[PDB]
Amino acid sequence: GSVVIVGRIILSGSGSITAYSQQTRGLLGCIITSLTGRDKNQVEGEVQVVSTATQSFLATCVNGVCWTVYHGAGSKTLAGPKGPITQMYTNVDQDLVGWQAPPGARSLTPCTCGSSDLYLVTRHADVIPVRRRGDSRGSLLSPRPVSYLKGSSGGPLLCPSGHAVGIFRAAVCTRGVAKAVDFVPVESMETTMRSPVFTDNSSPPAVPQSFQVAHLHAPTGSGKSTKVPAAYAAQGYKVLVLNPSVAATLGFGAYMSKAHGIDPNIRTGVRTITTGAPVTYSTYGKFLADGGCSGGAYDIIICDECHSTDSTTILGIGTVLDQAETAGARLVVLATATPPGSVTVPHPNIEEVALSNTGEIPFYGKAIPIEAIRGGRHLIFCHSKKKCDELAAKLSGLGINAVAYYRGLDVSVIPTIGDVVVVATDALMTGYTGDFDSVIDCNTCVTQTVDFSLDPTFTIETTTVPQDAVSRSQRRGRTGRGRRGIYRFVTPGERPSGMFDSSVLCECYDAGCAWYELTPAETSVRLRAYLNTPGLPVCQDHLEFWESVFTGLTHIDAHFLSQTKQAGDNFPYLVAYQATVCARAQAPPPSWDQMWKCLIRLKPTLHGPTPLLYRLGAVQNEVTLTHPITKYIMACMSADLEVVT
Numbered sequence: 001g002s003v004v005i006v007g008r009i010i011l012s013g014s015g016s017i018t019a020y021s022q023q024t025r026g027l028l029g030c031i032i033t034s035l036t037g038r039d040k041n042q043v044e045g046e047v048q049v050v051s052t053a054t055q056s057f058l059a060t061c062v063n064g065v066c067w068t069v070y071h072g073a074g075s076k077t078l079a080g081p082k083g084p085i086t087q088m089y090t091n092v093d094q095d096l097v098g099w100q101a102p103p104g105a106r107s108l109t110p111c112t113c114g115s116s117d118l119y120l121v122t123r124h125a126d127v128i129p130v131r132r133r134g135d136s137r138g139s140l141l142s143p144r145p146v147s148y149l150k151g152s153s154g155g156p157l158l159c160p161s162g163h164a165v166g167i168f169r170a171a172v173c174t175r176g177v178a179k180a181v182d183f184v185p186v187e188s189m190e191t192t193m194r195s196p197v198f199t200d201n202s203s204p205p206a207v208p209q210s211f212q213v214a215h216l217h218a219p220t221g222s223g224k225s226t227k228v229p230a231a232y233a234a235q236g237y238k239v240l241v242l243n244p245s246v247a248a249t250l251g252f253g254a255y256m257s258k259a260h261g262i263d264p265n266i267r268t269g270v271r272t273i274t275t276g277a278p279v280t281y282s283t284y285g286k287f288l289a290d291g292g293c294s295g296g297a298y299d300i301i302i303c304d305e306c307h308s309t310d311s312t313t314i315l316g317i318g319t320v321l322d323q324a325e326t327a328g329a330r331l332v333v334l335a336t337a338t339p340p341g342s343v344t345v346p347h348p349n350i351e352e353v354a355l356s357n358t359g360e361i362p363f364y365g366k367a368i369p370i371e372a373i374r375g376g377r378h379l380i381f382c383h384s385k386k387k388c389d390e391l392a393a394k395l396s397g398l399g400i401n402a403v404a405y406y407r408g409l410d411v412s413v414i415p416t417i418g419d420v421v422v423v424a425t426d427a428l429m430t431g432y433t434g435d436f437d438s439v440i441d442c443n444t445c446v447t448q449t450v451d452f453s454l455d456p457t458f459t460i461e462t463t464t465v466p467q468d469a470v471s472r473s474q475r476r477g478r479t480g481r482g483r484r485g486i487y488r489f490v491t492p493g494e495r496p497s498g499m500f501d502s503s504v505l506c507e508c509y510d511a512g513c514a515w516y517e518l519t520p521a522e523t524s525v526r527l528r529a530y531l532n533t534p535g536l537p538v539c540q541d542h543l544e545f546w547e548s549v550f551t552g553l554t555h556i557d558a559h560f561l562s563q564t565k566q567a568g569d570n571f572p573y574l575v576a577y578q579a580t581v582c583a584r585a586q587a588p589p590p591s592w593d594q595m596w597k598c599l600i601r602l603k604p605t606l607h608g609p610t611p612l613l614y615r616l617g618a619v620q621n622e623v624t625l626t627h628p629i630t631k632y633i634m635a636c637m638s639a640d641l642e643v644v645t
């Protein structure tokens with residue numbers, strides 16, 4: 001659906017800067033208009049209140065373009081008088097998108113006076129004084145709870161003359177209290193408008209004389225992982241290809257041997273082969289385990305699937321970006337079919353059929369026709385293992401060959417020949433390479449998000465959420481490979497791609513500490529290189545914060561860590577660290593959930609309140625906050641933390 005204008009904030013044209021709202025449509029009008037994308041309402045003023053189905057924020061017209069934040073609007077169209085208006089500009093790096101302003105809208109114009117005295121206009125038509133502190137930052141004269149700024153993303157910062165200085169995008173907070181604001185400066189918008197609207201990154205980059213980072217955006221099946229490195233090698237270059245999937249990596253190796261007649265080096269935890277060839281396929285995980293870039297080893301490093309937002313890929317790519325030039329590489333290629341801001345479009349081979357309630361098998365509130373999976377080989381994506389186990393069972397007793405696949409299981413449980421219905425989490429994507437007669441998609445994913453909850457420190461929350469465009473296209477791509485395919489779905493849309501949560505940075509420090517012998521300072525260097533690089537997935541910059549947390553977690557119990565590592569669940573370092581503090585106090589873990597299984601054998605000797613460090617799940621035991629590590633982390637919570645509004 002489209003973003004819809006539901007009101008405006010009218011600004012005074014003389015005297016002191018003041019504002020007032022005008023609400024132009026209600027909930028029903030908004031939803032209808034979002035669906036058609038056709039909005040016949042008169043548009044007035046320059047600051048628009050806009051809404052999607054779920055959120056509301058602001059959009060500001062400057063120089064004839066209606067601007068707002070990517071984190072709010074994603075790549076969505078804007079409902080307009082002649083139908084949906086497509087974005088003219090989408091800049092995920094800057095968190096800024098623009099639509100050509102619909103007729104009737106007035107525009108603000110850039111400030112010429114250079115004043116440092118700014119005024120932020122909120123969705124409630126408050127006018128808030130802000131002292132400019134740098135290109136994109138300003139301090140609030142009166143700090144306010146961050147809730148006060150929520151839904152004001154996309155609103156203008158004005159100079160005392162009422163001209164545009166920039167567009168509000170995030171609040172910098174000290175323990176939930178906004179002390180400063182982050183905004184996209186107007187000169188970035190001016191530059192955008194002077195620059196091309198259309199760009200092409202589909203051709204393999206030429207190898208420059210000196211180090212460059214380049215992007216390769218090219219369709220699945222275009223040969224990014226195979227054809228491209230083989231060509232570079234044919235030209236005399238040494239090439240490293242990094243991929244998030246062990247199965248894919250091992251597969252590229254076999255394919256190159258039997259096709260281009262070269263047996264590449266292969267580097268994975270399960271299988272490492274040195275052939276001396278000028279091409280090496282590695283996982284990001286094994287590359288990190290190997291210590292990153294070997295001096296003089298490669299001319300070209302291709303970071304394959306560079307849109308991937310798992311912590312291993314991010315840490316791996318940050319490592320390449322920080323080390324490649326010094327290691328003597330000439331080219332880093334950031335390769336993906338789905339770069340930030342990309343959206344899924346129709347595929348010639350794949351018919352997409354919405355599920356209905358007519359069907360013999362209940363599926364995520366809808367139903368699957370038993371006749372749709374009866375003959376053949378099929379893939380059903382579920383959000384969880386528990387759901388895979390259930391739906392499988394509803395098939396082993398209902399008379400069908402069906403197996404569940406998810407993290408922890410061996411790939412051979414999936415038959416490669418014979419009729420089958422595979423029921424899997426996204427773990428499939430990196431464990432198994434094959435394709436299917438059809439794909440059925442629940443259209444939801446499990447994700448982790450950090451909450452700076454101060455109770456006492458932070459919480460990592462696990463929730464099920466609607467899939468993003470990357471998820472949709474990757475799940476859908478498991479069918480229609482070279483031959484006719486069918487994609488059935490529960491919900492039609494997709495969340496915007498190219499963004500990831502601060503909890504993922506937490507996971508990077510955790511892996512640095514648990515697996516790769518990286519000090520948190522070293523981890524920060526690698527993650528900074530990633531964050532400093534345009535065209536990659538984006539995230540809030542919480543590096544100093546996470547570094548400070550892990551820096552204090554010293555003298556972990558080596559045995560507990562060895563166990564959490566092998567068990568393969570998330571946050572092995574944070575888990576083993578909480579277990580260490582508990583064991584040393586002879587205190588019970590936060591609960592007896594399986595997360596805490598390394599303590600189970602000690603159960604009869606653990607008593608009293610848990611010295612709680614942070615929250616990674618439900619806490620059922622009574623807690624104490626007196627432990628020095630708890631106090632240390634609480635102190636860490638005082639850091640400036642930028643959060644979107």
Ligand SMILES: [Zn+2]
Nearest residue numbers: 111112113159
């Ligand atoms: Zn001015």
